[PDB]
């Protein structure tokens, strides 16, 4: 009893507290700190909230039984919820402070749980040395139900924040596997399926140019939308300047050394590109000046094999 009144009001506080954060993610100024995403706090949130599961557990389980046992029952779910309390504020100011919407979002989710762990404190009250028959343990099972639908809620709305936090991630990520499938079969000892003409492989190297500026930018962005469209049209602009250069490559009219260079440049080409987007996916996951900065360097490495490729293509007409 005497801790079901002290937990109510450090809960109180504990919700006032994230109403505090609210505030803040609302008026566009919970920032990130330094260079971290969601995934630096994503599992602390995940495991402490199923520790408030089994904390649910004990609080129906101590409902009947010591005085001593009901009031650690409560003690202990008041400091797990304090503790997901205070890792959901840090993972929703992890999303920065243009992401001000889900933020919030987050934040009232553990407001949520917050809230009905005030509830089922009180069922416990209410309960305390009733038996079976008594309409306040039916109440208790009951709050107890309310409360882990809340925390699975919590749990649905943290996979959707992360969902949303790598769907570009895991798009860039099938697009390096594509290029891969590409290169290995550029690299085949198989023939392409016709021949081209040095004019197409020039046009479609110079595509590389244009998609590599497009990933240059959605690194620099960390835009999870910019991502995506990086992805499609990597993938398109590898696909294609492989293809335009094993077909002008194995034409008849191009002499083995030509082709040699060519083919060796679309591998270099390819693999520099790999690289680069090697690169974002690590950017994507610690955005610093300087991790993206290191960007640059990476496209002038890709420019230099483009240049390789045009020169070998002018050397084929």
């Not at 034409?251 to 191009?254: A, L």
């Given at each position: 009893t005497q801790a079901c009144i002290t937990a109510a009001s450090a809960v109180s506080g504990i919700i006032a507290d994230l109403d505090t954060t609210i505030m803040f993610a609302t008026a566009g100024t919970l920032n990130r700190e330094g260079?971290?995403?969601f995934a630096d706090h994503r599992e602390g949130i995940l495991k402490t909230a199923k520790v408030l599961v089994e904390d649910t557990k004990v609080l129906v389980q101590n409902a009947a039984g010591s005085q001593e046992k009901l009031a650690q029952a409560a003690q202990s779910s008041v400091a797990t919820i304090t503790r997901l309390a205070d890792v959901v504020k840090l993972g929703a100011a992890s999303l920065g402070a243009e992401d001000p919407e889900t933020q919030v979002v987050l934040i009232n989710a553990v407001k949520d749980v917050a809230k009905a762990l005030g509830d089922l404190i009180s069922a416990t009250k209410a309960a305390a040395g009733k038996v079976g028959d008594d309409p306040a343990v039916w109440q208790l099972k009951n709050s107890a139900k309310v409360m882990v639908t809340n925390v699975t809620s919590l749990l649905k709305t943290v996979k959707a924040v992360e969902d949303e936090a790598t769907k570009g991630t895991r798009a860039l990520e099938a697009t390096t596997e594509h290029i891969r499938q590409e290169l290995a079969v550029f690299c085949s000892p198989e023939p392409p399926a016709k021949t081209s003409t040095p004019e197409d492989f020039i046009r479609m190297t110079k595509g590389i140019t244009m998609a590599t500026a497009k990933a240059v930018a959605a690194g620099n962005s960390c835009r999870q939308e910019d991502v995506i469209a990086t992805a499609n049209l990597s993938r398109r602009a590898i696909a294609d300047m492989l293809r335009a250069c094993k077909e002008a490559a194995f034409?008849?009219?191009?002499a083995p050394d030509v082709r040699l260079r060519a083919l060796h440049y679309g591998r270099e080409c390819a693999n520099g590109y790999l690289e680069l987007l090697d690169h974002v996916l690590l950017t994507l996951q610690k955005p610093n000046p300087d991790l993206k900065q290191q960007l640059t360097g990476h496209s002038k490495r890709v420019a230099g094999s483009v240049t390789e490729l045009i020169q070998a293509a002018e050397a084929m007409k």
């Open positions: 260079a971290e995403t034409h008849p009219e191009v």
